[PDB]
Design an enzyme around this catalytic site. Structure first.
Site, PDB file in Angstrom:
ATOM      1  N   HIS A 125      56.735  56.813  74.667  1.00  0.00           N
ATOM      2  CA  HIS A 125      56.640  56.856  76.127  1.00  0.00           C
ATOM      3  C   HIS A 125      55.164  57.032  76.522  1.00  0.00           C
ATOM      4  O   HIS A 125      54.648  56.333  77.412  1.00  0.00           O
ATOM      5  CB  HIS A 125      57.484  58.009  76.673  1.00  0.00           C
ATOM      6  CG  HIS A 125      57.227  58.326  78.116  1.00  0.00           C
ATOM      7  ND1 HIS A 125      57.458  57.426  79.136  1.00  0.00           N
ATOM      8  CD2 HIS A 125      56.769  59.455  78.712  1.00  0.00           C
ATOM      9  CE1 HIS A 125      57.154  57.986  80.295  1.00  0.00           C
ATOM     10  NE2 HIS A 125      56.731  59.215  80.065  1.00  0.00           N
ATOM     11  N   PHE A 156      68.291  55.488  91.326  1.00  0.00           N
ATOM     12  CA  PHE A 156      66.930  55.797  90.904  1.00  0.00           C
ATOM     13  C   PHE A 156      65.960  54.759  91.456  1.00  0.00           C
ATOM     14  O   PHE A 156      64.899  55.100  91.982  1.00  0.00           O
ATOM     15  CB  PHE A 156      66.880  55.821  89.373  1.00  0.00           C
ATOM     16  CG  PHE A 156      65.509  56.040  88.801  1.00  0.00           C
ATOM     17  CD1 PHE A 156      64.683  57.049  89.288  1.00  0.00           C
ATOM     18  CD2 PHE A 156      65.067  55.271  87.724  1.00  0.00           C
ATOM     19  CE1 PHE A 156      63.435  57.292  88.710  1.00  0.00           C
ATOM     20  CE2 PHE A 156      63.821  55.505  87.137  1.00  0.00           C
ATOM     21  CZ  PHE A 156      63.004  56.521  87.632  1.00  0.00           C
ATOM     22  N   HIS A 213      49.792  63.092  79.230  1.00  0.00           N
ATOM     23  CA  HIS A 213      50.705  63.499  80.302  1.00  0.00           C
ATOM     24  C   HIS A 213      52.055  64.147  79.961  1.00  0.00           C
ATOM     25  O   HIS A 213      52.591  64.874  80.787  1.00  0.00           O
ATOM     26  CB  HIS A 213      50.912  62.348  81.290  1.00  0.00           C
ATOM     27  CG  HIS A 213      52.100  61.491  80.991  1.00  0.00           C
ATOM     28  ND1 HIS A 213      52.085  60.505  80.030  1.00  0.00           N
ATOM     29  CD2 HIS A 213      53.349  61.493  81.513  1.00  0.00           C
ATOM     30  CE1 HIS A 213      53.276  59.935  79.971  1.00  0.00           C
ATOM     31  NE2 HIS A 213      54.060  60.517  80.859  1.00  0.00           N
ATOM     32  N   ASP A 214      52.597  63.912  78.768  1.00  0.00           N
ATOM     33  CA  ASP A 214      53.879  64.526  78.387  1.00  0.00           C
ATOM     34  C   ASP A 214      53.829  65.194  77.014  1.00  0.00           C
ATOM     35  O   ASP A 214      54.872  65.464  76.424  1.00  0.00           O
ATOM     36  CB  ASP A 214      55.005  63.482  78.342  1.00  0.00           C
ATOM     37  CG  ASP A 214      55.681  63.278  79.679  1.00  0.00           C
ATOM     38  OD1 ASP A 214      55.842  64.265  80.423  1.00  0.00           O
ATOM     39  OD2 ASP A 214      56.071  62.123  79.973  1.00  0.00           O
ATOM     40  N   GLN A 270      70.996  54.448  87.722  1.00  0.00           N
ATOM     41  CA  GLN A 270      69.832  53.571  87.670  1.00  0.00           C
ATOM     42  C   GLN A 270      69.634  52.880  89.012  1.00  0.00           C
ATOM     43  O   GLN A 270      68.500  52.707  89.468  1.00  0.00           O
ATOM     44  CB  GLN A 270      69.976  52.530  86.558  1.00  0.00           C
ATOM     45  CG  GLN A 270      69.677  53.083  85.175  1.00  0.00           C
ATOM     46  CD  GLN A 270      68.343  53.820  85.121  1.00  0.00           C
ATOM     47  OE1 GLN A 270      67.290  53.256  85.428  1.00  0.00           O
ATOM     48  NE2 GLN A 270      68.387  55.089  84.736  1.00  0.00           N
ATOM     49  N   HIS A 327      60.836  61.482  76.166  1.00  0.00           N
ATOM     50  CA  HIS A 327      59.494  62.038  76.329  1.00  0.00           C
ATOM     51  C   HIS A 327      58.786  62.279  75.006  1.00  0.00           C
ATOM     52  O   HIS A 327      58.536  63.425  74.609  1.00  0.00           O
ATOM     53  CB  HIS A 327      59.549  63.337  77.150  1.00  0.00           C
ATOM     54  CG  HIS A 327      59.997  63.131  78.567  1.00  0.00           C
ATOM     55  ND1 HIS A 327      61.251  63.484  79.012  1.00  0.00           N
ATOM     56  CD2 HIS A 327      59.362  62.580  79.630  1.00  0.00           C
ATOM     57  CE1 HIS A 327      61.373  63.159  80.287  1.00  0.00           C
ATOM     58  NE2 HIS A 327      60.240  62.608  80.686  1.00  0.00           N
ATOM     59  N   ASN A 341      59.396  51.808  83.734  1.00  0.00           N
ATOM     60  CA  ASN A 341      60.461  51.255  82.884  1.00  0.00           C
ATOM     61  C   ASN A 341      61.322  50.196  83.586  1.00  0.00           C
ATOM     62  O   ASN A 341      61.613  49.152  83.007  1.00  0.00           O
ATOM     63  CB  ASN A 341      61.406  52.352  82.355  1.00  0.00           C
ATOM     64  CG  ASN A 341      60.706  53.397  81.498  1.00  0.00           C
ATOM     65  OD1 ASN A 341      59.649  53.152  80.915  1.00  0.00           O
ATOM     66  ND2 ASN A 341      61.313  54.568  81.406  1.00  0.00           N
ATOM     67  N   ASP A 377      54.220  55.866  84.922  1.00  0.00           N
ATOM     68  CA  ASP A 377      55.208  56.782  84.354  1.00  0.00           C
ATOM     69  C   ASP A 377      56.612  56.375  84.817  1.00  0.00           C
ATOM     70  O   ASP A 377      57.612  56.697  84.175  1.00  0.00           O
ATOM     71  CB  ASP A 377      54.877  58.214  84.796  1.00  0.00           C
ATOM     72  CG  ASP A 377      55.642  59.277  84.023  1.00  0.00           C
ATOM     73  OD1 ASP A 377      55.844  59.141  82.790  1.00  0.00           O
ATOM     74  OD2 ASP A 377      56.010  60.285  84.659  1.00  0.00           O
TER      75      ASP A 377
HETATM   76  C1  LIG Z   1      65.426  63.319  86.380  1.00  0.00           C
HETATM   77  C2  LIG Z   1      64.029  62.774  86.103  1.00  0.00           C
HETATM   78  C3  LIG Z   1      63.708  62.738  84.615  1.00  0.00           C
HETATM   79  C4  LIG Z   1      63.719  61.465  86.844  1.00  0.00           C
HETATM   80  N1  LIG Z   1      64.451  60.353  86.242  1.00  0.00           N
HETATM   81  C5  LIG Z   1      65.703  59.976  86.652  1.00  0.00           C
HETATM   82  O1  LIG Z   1      66.252  60.605  87.549  1.00  0.00           O
HETATM   83  N2  LIG Z   1      66.370  58.888  86.081  1.00  0.00           N
HETATM   84  C6  LIG Z   1      67.697  58.527  86.553  1.00  0.00           C
HETATM   85  C7  LIG Z   1      65.781  58.155  85.080  1.00  0.00           C
HETATM   86  O2  LIG Z   1      66.363  57.201  84.585  1.00  0.00           O
HETATM   87  C8  LIG Z   1      64.514  58.505  84.638  1.00  0.00           C
HETATM   88  N3  LIG Z   1      63.674  57.972  83.671  1.00  0.00           N
HETATM   89  C9  LIG Z   1      62.612  58.740  83.722  1.00  0.00           C
HETATM   90  N4  LIG Z   1      62.699  59.739  84.661  1.00  0.00           N
HETATM   91  C10 LIG Z   1      63.931  59.592  85.255  1.00  0.00           C
HETATM   92 MG   LIG Z   2      56.145  64.486  82.796  1.00  0.00          MG
HETATM   93 ZN   LIG Z   3      56.080  60.677  81.432  1.00  0.00          ZN
END
Ligand SMILES: CC(C)Cn1c(=O)n(C)c(=O)c2nc[nH]c21
Ligand SMILES: [Mg+2]
Ligand SMILES: [Zn+2]
Ligand SMILES: CC(C)Cn1c(=O)n(C)c(=O)c2nc[nH]c21
Ligand SMILES: CC(C)Cn1c(=O)n(C)c(=O)c2nc[nH]c21
Ligand SMILES: CC(C)Cn1c(=O)n(C)c(=O)c2nc[nH]c21
Ligand SMILES: [Mg+2]
Ligand SMILES: [Mg+2]
Ligand SMILES: [Mg+2]
Ligand SMILES: [Zn+2]
Ligand SMILES: [Zn+2]
Ligand SMILES: [Zn+2]
Lengths: 330, 334, 334, 327
Positions: free
Chosen positions: B86, B294, B122-123, B291, B82, B243, B240
């Site tokens: 990003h 996710f 945003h971050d 992953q 973050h 990735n 957001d």
């Molecule tokens: C936990 C939260 C940041 C959401 N989140 C997540 O769970 N995983 C596994 C990621 O790789 C990821 N990348 C950004 N946000 C993510």
């Molecule tokens: Mg955020």
């Molecule tokens: Zn973000």
């Protein structure tokens, strides 16, 4: 660390906790970037502060890690390593012979706590930079000792996080006194207060009254705080008095922080602050100048106060002074 | 940095990379290195120019650059995921999503401005730890925001507060109407990045896909504010969470960073004797499995629904996502 | 757009009163009533027009009035003494002091603006209690300002912060150098109103009187920033402590107000089991004696020194102070 | 003491709907919030249950009351005292006997006490339109409600003010979440959804072996507490006419002041805030018809028939204002 290598090396290093020239950088690496937490903890046990003030160990470790967490890892000089160093240096200065049995446990605590938080949440840029950009922090503090005021506010505020109130067992009277001493000490770390601080210190040396014990006599708050303020101030400005090996690491770090501020000012089209322009710097020359007009003048006066306690410290200073002087290009 | 008004060798290379600003898969990491760790500033500046936003909103160039560097300076260099890279990525990703054919001439300049500004801030000032960690440590941030969308509220507040520093008010020439509208949309967008809002956002996005209506030019039709902002919220939310939809080379770099950030929080949680958050234990983690999970439960459901909304403009993006998903699948150790 | 900055059908009578804006002894209370509790706004507006500061500093009139209303709104209507009426009074008083013959053409327009603005915000958002009360209760304010000049630091912060509200930046057209200079002087002045600095200020004022220099014109010579800001600090300090030097009729209303505020604090300290502050105990009070003491140890030594600095411009102000002192002495219950 | 008798006399109705809160304000030297909170805390034995030292409690109560603006006609310490006492009566309703824990009870009472603290006397939109620091901090969202919470909790940090110092970490965490949930729900922007959820609960209403409300999960329990305090906050029209008219005068005085300030600044004057174009009576009837009655009617259902008298008084008051509506 457990019964292994990684521990032995750390614990072996923490053995020098009472000596000038502690390998703080080694400790930082070995402790996983927790020099402030381990050094503060060691000094607290060393001085028996946990018992004296009934500080639960877990509350102390939690507060320490929190405080250390609020020092910026991305700042070359004003980070947790510098804080641990100022703390350890103050701890050593507190043990000087000439001050034997002079300060109370609470006053000792104040000097050490103040040292620990004196630079927390430092963004790596000066007050003037924050003032010029009209930062929120500058608006809040009216362009006056902006960062110093902020270091204090954050240090105290962090006591409020979960299980962080290390003073939870101090009486109201102790808290009021501690708070006032901590504030007086940290605010004195603003370099804009250097001259007057040094002046009053010299005037005090010219009144130097020793007791039947041959130890300095301080019979009032004003004199007591003034010594504590200058002590912590000397600790904050002690890099030049440390073994060349350390002094040099500090110099590279401060310069990197200054140059980084310089690049930011250059980016913004602002006038580049003194010693912050990497394209026209005199690192060697600036150090010599720093020692000549501020560090040496200060430590010399302090040496007079605790004479001859800090004689070796001065020699190291005057020596390092020559080292840099002889490295000045031509 | 240039010489006699001409680009430096580095600036030239930077410029050539920026030639892919309108493309999904920009080498945002190379841009960060070439720009001296100023990915957000350069990408934002490039994008504002490309969209003629400085002229449209009479933003003086010096003010824009000053605010950009200031905003970028408030992202933490020590935070692995973050950070400003990003932020720059979400900005450029939103920028690409706004230009999708299905959304051609749908949004106004102000809405476009809002989606981009929201992406940029945003971050900002992200500490590298989750809302729950801030809540459990009783941080003052959590106290101030009553444990509700703590970080998201803070990002917004910082993003807007920085406009008050010397020569930083990029919206100085907007009328009150433009500003109140801009502000409302930006706030609505950033608060929507809080994952706790994910499900309802996705539920709403689907509802819209169900009742989706195209115009005379086969473009999406969005009357009311509720539907327009909803699409913008989902657009930035997709950005957001983009990735996994990027070429594997970029995706893996993002994964390493988020995992590094997660593990650091886990380490702090362990030092503190706190329960270690999900996926934050470096001693008990399954990067590949996480992953895959996710993507299956969050990323794919969201993008598939978005791919549907702008069908078929997001086809390639979805194919890349599914391919990365399978890749991580075959990596899971048995 | 109204004539005096605020709507009012009694406008005619308000005009009659405002004609005395350059006079020591203005009927500020009457002006407060006629303006609808807008004494600070109309008096500041009047002084700015009279001194041509709107033109000189390119301050749009609607912006000035919006800020003034905003500033005034931030003084507490429930606080008997440290409110908008006191603020208006200090401003008008500073305005008269600035016009004293001995200081003609001595100060620049920027220095004049600083003194006036400083007077206007010097007590904004005052809670009606002292710094010690805020410190002894561990208030958030004392925490923020590390127990040092807590109220004064707060007055300044709020004063400048309000410039950020909608259409409130009256300094929007000043150059960066003008703003930094102005800002520094304002801060130096307001911080000097902290009574804990009274003695040091006065001591310096005396030293200046001892080394008093005048130009070819019979006007005070102030060679450096230090002497300049010092005279301005003492000037505003004199205006803040000018109640006893005004016509008895006005002075008595001020005494009634500060006493009511003090007793208010005393009752609060009593409820909380705190030690009651001096002069704050309505059960054990000597209003008259306290005023005489206030004059003998604080007000008269300051004004006698100031009178010597601008001799003989303030002879009448000093004579009134002495007439009032005797009055309270003759009312002490024996 | 002469009045100490009158105070204790009036305080005998602390468990009754329609308490002369205004008289208590005068008799206590404008300390209604403090005295009523103290009485209720003793009445419910809360100091012992949570080991709250009496000195700490009263200090915090005074400190909290002090942060209510004495210059504000409606949203002041009197309104807070009234909402606390009303919440107190509602918690004692027969349909809820032994339903809520002492922590949940403490949460509802505390939240009522702090729900409007440091209210400036102007609406959220006014704060938003002027770009006030508060609106910037809270991103124009539940600006004041968020602030009331922040101040309520921050004041626990003052000298001898931590009334929760003896609660376990578990209790503190639970209480904090509940209090936040309750106060955030007083935001009129949350009204419609709260009501919708209260109605749904009434539809699927269930009772225990003892006949009291069956609240199975946090979601259901907090929803009932949120609406309870919300009803307490919007209970003016349900009180006997004499008190109700006093509250109407106060709220209209606050609204009109805001209108005067908006007009001075050349801002659009907010609804019902224009003293030159107001319809006090009409506004009260519309407020009751579209918000107060739908809310109390559903609550009355949930606790049937405990709130029957309250609902009847409400409908009578509505008829009364209706007859004063000009033309
Ligand atoms: C936990 C939260 C940041 C959401 N989140 C997540 O769970 N995983 C596994 C990621 O790789 C990821 N990348 C950004 N946000 C993510
Ligand atoms: Mg955020
Ligand atoms: Zn973000
Ligand atoms: C305040 C500043 C001038 C003092 N100062 C300095 O001059 N140099 C060169 C340093 O490296 C340094 N490190 C801390 N303070 C320093
Ligand atoms: C000490 C002083 C600044 C405060 N103070 C005071 O003590 N008395 C008696 C006053 O009449 C008065 N009027 C304003 N300030 C006052
Ligand atoms: C609309 C609402 C949030 C404000 N509001 C209102 O409009 N009327 C008429 C009231 O009596 C009232 N009482 C509290 N809030 C009120
Ligand atoms: Mg420092
Ligand atoms: Mg003052
Ligand atoms: Mg409310
Ligand atoms: Zn330091
Ligand atoms: Zn004053
Ligand atoms: Zn309310």
């Amino acid at each position: 660390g457990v019964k292994t290598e990684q521990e032995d090396v750390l614990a072996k290093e923490l053995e020098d906790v009472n000596k000038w020239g502690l390998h703080v950088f080694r400790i930082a690496e070995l402790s996983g970037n927790r020099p402030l937490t381990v050094i503060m903890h060691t000094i607290f046990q060393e001085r028996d502060l946990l018992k004296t003030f009934k500080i639960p160990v877990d509350t102390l470790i939690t507060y320490l890690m929190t405080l250390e967490d609020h020092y910026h890892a991305d700042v070359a000089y004003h980070n947790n390593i510098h804080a641990a160093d100022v703390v350890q240096s103050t701890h050593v200065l507190l043990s000087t012979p000439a001050l034997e049995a002079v300060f109370t446990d609470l006053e000792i605590l104040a000097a050490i706590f103040a040292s620990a938080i004196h630079d927390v949440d430092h963004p790596g840029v000066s007050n003037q930079f924050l003032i010029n950009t009209n930062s929120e922090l500058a608006l809040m503090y009216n362009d006056s000792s902006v960062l110093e005021n902020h270091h204090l506010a954050v240090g105290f505020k962090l006591l409020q996080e979960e299980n962080c109130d290390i003073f939870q067992n101090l009486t109201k009277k102790q808290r009021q006194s501690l708070r006032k001493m901590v504030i007086d000490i940290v605010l004195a770390t603003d370099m804009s207060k250097h001259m007057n601080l040094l002046a009053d210190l010299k005037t005090m040396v010219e009144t130097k009254k020793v007791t039947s014990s041959g130890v300095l006599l301080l019979d009032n708050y004003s004199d007591r705080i003034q010594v504590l303020q200058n002590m912590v101030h000397c600790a904050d400005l002690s890099n030049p008095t440390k073994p060349l090996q350390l002094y040099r690491q500090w110099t590279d770090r401060i310069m990197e922080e200054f140059f980084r501020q310089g690049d930011r000012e250059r980016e913004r089209g602002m006038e580049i602050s003194p010693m912050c322009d990497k394209h026209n710097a005199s690192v060697e020359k600036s150090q010599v100048g720093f020692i000549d007009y501020i560090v040496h003048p200060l430590w010399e006066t302090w040496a007079d106060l605790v004479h001859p306690d800090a004689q070796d410290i001065l020699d190291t200073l005057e020596d390092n002074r020559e080292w840099y002087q002889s490295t000045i290009p031509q």
